């Protein structure tokens, strides 16, 4: 209702049965791009550090 | 999530410590916004009750097997460190009293019994 | 389940492959990597 | 409290189970309440061996047959390294300067230009 | 999923120490094989194993320095013994910042990858451990090797800073009910005094390394003398980190020895307040001296006289600790178990390796010993025989309590004697080679330096056999370790006294001065529910 | 700071108030942990204390510790010619007469 949803979200984060970082119905929008792009950032620095040990440049 | 406490006589868990709400246009007070183990200290200190004790061991009287020093615990064991009856004579010796056996402190000799609350 | 084989990250008893192979391969890799590095940098610089 | 249960406990005490050990102690503790000079010699020996004796937690850390094991384990740790280091000693690259007929020509040059006057000069090590 | 949330996404402080131990074992194996590569080349005159390459000799020396200054001694002495034992000694449940403990662990496997990849993409990084400016520029090392090696000294710095702030913040406000900060054990004081130097030393190193990077790749000329800079500045900005660092490696060792001397000799430590004041004095006087590593660079004549005076003063607090250890071992009863063997071999060899430091402190005598193998023989008697011995003693002391599985005594004794003999054969003729005049960092030498180099190549093959026997000791500990407690009475923490009967001793077995040896031995995940009480 | 005539009164008072075997062995263990050897009066109290709690091996092990605390052999035999009516009344046998 009003801007004091503080007395409402404190009855939700308690008794949730899910972890804190994935409890709200908004954490999809933060957690899907971050873990999506992290698996590209790590998979690009393990291709350019093995291509470079063989002497190949760009 | 349930009925809110007013004193610590009506606190049967974390389900009684949410509280009322603040009003629109006011900097809220700690009695209007606190949930967990923070509000429990708050309801203790506005009466005079210290929830988290910081008082050390009894260093007045010794320990006989007939009349032992009673150490209070909510478990079956509690670690007790003896350092003397004038409180700094004995060195630091640690002991574990249990609900089936009493510790006896190999240097000075005090006996400790466990009181299960 | 607290007990003498509960705080370790690897399983030791009641295991399909016996523990000697994962214990030996750890030390084999640990004492075999810095010879591979010397082999690569020797072969990149002409000498055998 | 028979003689067979008490006599010669120095060779049987570590083999009895822990329910035949707590009966001998609880039968010598109602025999010590009697005034002494009424105890047999075997009970006096057993009461000393049960509490103050070389069984259980009063064993030594090192026995006589363990120091021999440590000594002959260190020797077969030194012999292996000598045989490994010998294999990297036959197969060496020996440069031309390490020969006796080359280290005797160096001594004449070090003798003409006076070098090491006080101690010694000698480049010969075969 | 329960594997991930408990050994990868962790909060418990005692479960990160075991991961630190597993990492430290690997990073101490790699450097030891790299040292065996070096010592098998410095055997007889000529070019033996590395065919003609004087690169891939300096790279091996650099990577053997870095993997055991930064990746073995610090993770063992901070992660395995500091994270595990300090909450149990002060009586806390966990650390104050647990996620910072997790990041302080997990910054190190990305630091190993960059260092191992600093030796495959190019000639390599043969700059030495001290990465001096005018050699490590873009005229000798032009490639991604030095850059990826000075990015492995940033992540370790961040990890050490985040661990030190956690250690200081925990011991201030997370103690039990009856402990002031004068009843603390000595190991907690050792961790506090190393954590203050970790705050006060690492910004200078980070600044100097970053300015070297900017000189290499953004053409800034801080340390190039064609634009108005001096290389000597970097030396200042290195060695202000360098001498705190070498006490960071040795202060957590000292306290460990104290516990063993307090335990297996059944006496309390002689003068504990003098010992904590001595550690404070050693920690403070390690920051006011840094220029005794640089006496030949061309300093003033009135500046050498200050740094000879301020260096020999550090002998006075260390003698208090040594003589107090002797006074503790004097009166009591001594039983020779495998921690006390390493304890006895530490009080003699630290003295021998430390008395050489007084000879090198003089500016007149440093003209004959600088960049010479006397320095190497000085600091190997203190690093390999002072810190690694303390680590082995700490492992053989605290491993039955942590793990719950005992070990064979005889094989541990054989390992100790092999380490002793081989390491005393290896580093003693380096003094003779130094006094005769052999310089440092040379693959090939004149033919006069041959004979002692034949003897110092023999002890390394003895020490590697001891490492393999240590591996078998760990394997015999993990398998059938429940049945290795009745073979010997070494498993007992304290012996029965003269008047204490065996029947009385079996009822009351453990007598201690800390909380450590009264726990159940697997330590519980949540070990304190109700608080501990001290009078 | 403690003198002989205060040591040999304080340990008599401590030995004349023990109630169990743990306490007798506790006071006996820290009596032989100073620079002063125990007096013949203190050891005479310790054997009566071992008699009240009814233990035999402790009354033998007291005389064995005197052989290690005392510097020479003549002083040990000077201790045994004055603690003789205590031994032959209670009945305590030494270790070298039992041969255990
Ligand atoms: C491992 C840690 C460590 C330790 C403990 C020390 C200990 C000391 N070090 Fe340091 N030092 C290093 C790390 C360490 N050092 C390293 C790694 C190097 C090599 C440099 C490199 O190349 O990067 C080095 C090299 C080094 C040098 C040579 C620098 C050069 O090559 O020119 C010097 C000289 O001033 C020095 C100083 C000292 C001194 C005076 C001590 C003293 O603290 C030693 C104190 C010990 C005692 C004195 C024993 C006490 C016994 C007593 C009973 C006291 C009796 C009193 C008297 C002797 C008067 N060290
Ligand atoms: C960290 C301290 C340390 C350690 C441990 C060692 C270990 C050894 N070092 Fe030293 N050494 C240095 C300090 C150290 N060194 C430094 C700083 C340099 C660089 C100098 C420079 O760059 O200018 C150097 C370089 C160096 C060189 C090259 C010198 C140069 O190129 O100018 C040599 C060659 O003789 C040598 C000798 C040895 C030998 C034979 C060992 C052997 O002892 C190796 C065998 C190792 C073991 C005996 C211990 C194994 C450890 C574990 C497996 C135990 C794990 C612990 C737990 C389980 C808790 N070292
Ligand atoms: C020669 C090659 C090396 C062989 C070493 C063999 C050593 C085995 C003997 C041994 O370990 O003795 C223990 C240590 O003794 C010692 O006193 C050795 C010295 C210990 C300090 C060494 C560090 C310097 C005794 O131990 P113990 O007390 O059980 O002997 C009980 C009787 N008294
Ligand atoms: C630059 C590197 C150092 C910056 C770290 C500063 C952290 C200061 C704030 C702080 O100490 O709080 C901790 C981290 O918070 C934080 O502020 C998280 C900062 C983490 C930055 C990691 C370094 C990335 C570069 C709490 O952390 P906690 O979760 O254990 O508190 C658990 C109880 N609420
Ligand atoms: Cu220094
Ligand atoms: Zn006490």
Structural features, described:
The structure is cut from a larger assembly and holds chains A (58 residues), B (117 residues), C (48 residues), D (126 residues), E (535 residues) and F (100 residues). Chain A has helices at 6-9, 27-44. Chain A has 58 residues and is mainly α. Chain C has helices spanning 20-30, 33-43. The longest helix of chain C has 11 residues, at 20-30. Chain E is built from 24 helices and one strand. By secondary structure, chain E is mostly helical. Chain E has helices at residues 4-7, 14-39, 58-69, 73-80, 82-90, 98-106, 109-116, 146-149, 152-173, 186-217, 232-248, 251-263, 272-284, 301-312, 315-331, 338-361, 366-369, 373-383, 387-403, 409-427, 429-436, 450-455, 459-478, 502-507, and one strand at residues 533-534. Strand 2 of chain B pairs parallel with strand 1 (533-534) of chain E, so a sheet runs across the interface. Residues 243, 292-293 of chain E line the site of copper (II) ion.
Show the helix and strand layout.
The structure is cut from a larger assembly and holds chains A (58 residues), B (117 residues), C (48 residues), D (126 residues), E (535 residues) and F (100 residues).
Chain A: H1 6-9, H2 27-44
Chain B: H1 37-45, E1 69-73, E2 80-82, E3 93-95, E4 112-116
Parallel strand pairs in B: 1-4
Antiparallel strand pairs in B: 2-3
Chain F: H1 4-15, H2 21-31, H3 40-52, H4 57-69, H5 74-80, H6 87-90, H7 95-98
Bound molecules: heme-A (2 copies), phosphatidylethanolamine (2 copies), copper (II) ion and zinc ion.
